[PDB]
Design a protein around this ligand. Structure first.
Ligand SMILES: O=S(=O)(O)C[C@H]1O[C@@H](O)[C@H](O)[C@@H](O)[C@@H]1O
Ligand SMILES: O=S(=O)(O)C[C@H]1O[C@@H](O)[C@H](O)[C@@H](O)[C@@H]1O
Lengths: 255, 257, 257, 255
């Protein structure tokens, strides 16, 4: 549907028909992933807590989109969501661990409850999602995982320790998973965005200018920038790339 | 006390009388830290699950050593241990988040409970220990934190996802905490060992695996606990006052292959 | 032309008509770049020392290919090659600094002359080529530079100090040039291959060394020139418009061991 | 002499009597190295182009200091300086490749001559100095090399391409030299300072404040900070450390 952004004019034949699963798929960056892969003729499942946003997006994208309600905190539901995707469409080809919560929080204010919940929301699911997709990928002898990283921990960004720490954790999990699963044909990399303009983000003008001034390239990045990178990392054109970060940040991380 | 490993012949005057707190202090690398700082005239508190090992080591080291029993999974006890150190000796000067569990485990087999507990044992405590020491450090306007890292995740070592992932997490937490707390005078770095010969790590066979480390390393000798302790002393002293947010890798080149 | 490796089935509309300049273009990885961009409807100029290889390849590819003979050590010729490309086709859109010499050499034996020439062959040209393309890019307000990096220095590979040192130098030059030129619309990244099977790299024995790469890699297959070209196309296209200052490693995991 | 800074109160017994060689030793950071190691009872040789500054410093430090005039561009003189140190005191124990020129220069203005000279002044000597000291170290079965790095290339600092590029080059040379020479007992690491206040550096107040605001620790670093790190990297307390960077920058590189 021509009202939904295709994100790129590039055409990746290797993406047609591939089974893509994306967490936090109903808004922002995750929504853009969903749209971009749909536009490449992939069969795209997405998970999200927001049922009405989820169903509206699936309605807009049509029958090559599948919306599954899921609180990623709930690993049991997460593994059921995976099982359901497998039954419908077969083994996942591409997993994008995208779901995350970047609510700001001061070091001194974090309680044990808040820490644990933030870790469950930002880190734990990425591991279990990978664990769930892996055996089916291995049966086929191929598959691709993309962990959404962040330059925040790289730049040592203060004021959201749980989020930055989870993100840092994914940096390592990418490397060890790449080794653990590479022998099975599965490649795992991390897509690492800079400051991406989305609806959810936000004096807005002022903060946007500060990003431009800090960046090497003097324009704002958006969700399309992420999705273009994702398509490449999913396609057969990145077949030899594993264990690695790919940073799309207009230079924000190098200051 | 006359039989104790001092770990180095170096003397750091800035370490005398400093309050040092170390988790997993009763054996292996943690024990070496405790000995080394004691030998520099620091006041060293240490936490460990093993009460008998803890009390024997504190008895051997004497009155500038303080052993507090603590399961680091238990945040409430962790915070009580800190508060007790503070009441005894004042604000902590040096925190070393050392406690960890590197038991091997297969990716495919990890359950939700195993994951959570491994994360609590390897990661969570390091944040809360930091949070507990911070206010007292800030009141003074100075302090140092050392997070024990690992080259395992850097080398993408398989077969212990929870441990390597926690270690990678500490890599990030170092950087953000360094920024968040630096305005208060607190510096935070990660000490990142390679393959350290210890009693646990030990437990040809052993000989063969030890040779493979030497063959893979750039320097052809086995690193031990003392190598870690010497690095820790430097990172605690006034000679590293300006260093923060950073890794310091003591690995004889194992991570560069 | 009907017999030519296209390298990928992907189609990048943004690459059509773009002016692509590639050093060491006549063989191996450089030749693959030339073929791949030609297959996307780019206008591709390439530089190489080997005149007969160069002219045959341009003859095989046709009128959207332009071969300029060039010794990259000779900066004057390098700048003349650039100016000639500019006059033919306009401002370069994509520069790929690919020319290099990875001949093995012992640390202890390197002379002052060998060092200088190896640095001129492996490093110097990449800066001057960048400097030559920059003004034309800036006039348009857009452009992309790709510096061929190597995992060799990352893995601290011995036995070719000048090559690994040049490659490490490019790692830094990428970052500073990205900042220095980004205000003009120019993005700059490094494509960093692992162990690429080529005719030269080839020249059990071969079989045994090839197996050792597979055993050391995370993905159990040999990478080739096409793997590099596919990465290059992405880094040149509008799909990487926002990426700058960065490494992109295509190494099947060889650098993480 | 109590007019010359000792830089630290720490005492490293393993440094007593060790033969230390430092390039660009007569001013700024290099001078501080010379003073600090002298104060630890090392036998310290230093190289510098400035003969009067060199001789004044050697005069202040006494007979455990040795000043050799040397233009590091001249590799022949560099290798003679090394040979002379070896003859006087024996094999070098510690080499600090410090000599460098950080004159600012725009990308478009660099000529071929300027590039080559900057590379000879900033990079080439570090390799040849290492090559010269190595065989003597290997005979003994021990030695330590410290390459002065810089966070400038890490932070992608514009406006001095030759300097930042040389510095980046040393980052790699450290790793490969560590492997090449490790089997001989020689360790090689890079000491990587942030923005160090020296006499040569420099509205000065304003620029100094901007460094404090950018840094995680809110004080200015000085030459002493570098020397304290150098002593550790030279001593037996870092015996197991090789191939690595050690960054002393108050957090400036993580922004
Ligand atoms: O061999 S590495 O994993 O590269 C380095 C070492 O890291 C440690 O934290 C592990 O507990 C060791 O078992 C391991 O040997
Ligand atoms: O084996 S690595 O040195 O780690 C990767 C590869 O890097 C290339 O630039 C070298 O020219 C190859 O000869 C080498 O195989």
């Amino acid at each position: 549907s021509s009202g939904m952004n295709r994100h790129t004019d590039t055409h990746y034949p290797s993406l047609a028909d591939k089974v893509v699963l994306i967490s936090g798929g109903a808004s922002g960056i995750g929504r853009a992933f969903v749209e971009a892969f749909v536009a490449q003729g992939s069969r795209v499942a997405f998970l999200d807590l927001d049922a009405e946003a989820g169903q509206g997006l699936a309605h807009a994208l049509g029958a090559n989109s599948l919306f599954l309600p899921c609180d990623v905190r709930d690993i049991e539901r997460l593994k059921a969501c995976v099982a359901e995707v497998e039954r419908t469409w077969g083994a996942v080809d591409v997993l994008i661990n995208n779901a995350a919560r970047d609510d700001r929080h001061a070091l001194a204010d974090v309680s044990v409850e808040y820490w644990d919940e933030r870790m469950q929301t930002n880190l734990r699911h990425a591991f279990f999602a990978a664990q769930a997709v892996a055996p089916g990928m291995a049966r086929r002898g191929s598959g691709a995982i993309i962990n959404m990283g962040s330059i925040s921990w790289m730049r040592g960004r203060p004021g959201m320790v749980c989020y930055t720490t989870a993100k840092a954790a994914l940096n390592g999990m990418t490397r060890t998973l790449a080794r653990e699963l590479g022998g099975q044909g599965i490649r795992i990399n991390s897509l690492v965005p800079g400051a991406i303009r989305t609806e959810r983000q936000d004096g807005l003008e002022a903060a946007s200018q500060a990003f431009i001034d800090q960046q090497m390239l003097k324009f704002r990045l958006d969700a399309s920038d992420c999705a273009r990178l994702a398509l490449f990392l999913a396609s057969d054109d990145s077949r030899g790339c594993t264990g690695q970060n790919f940073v799309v940040d207009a230079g924000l991380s190098i200051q």
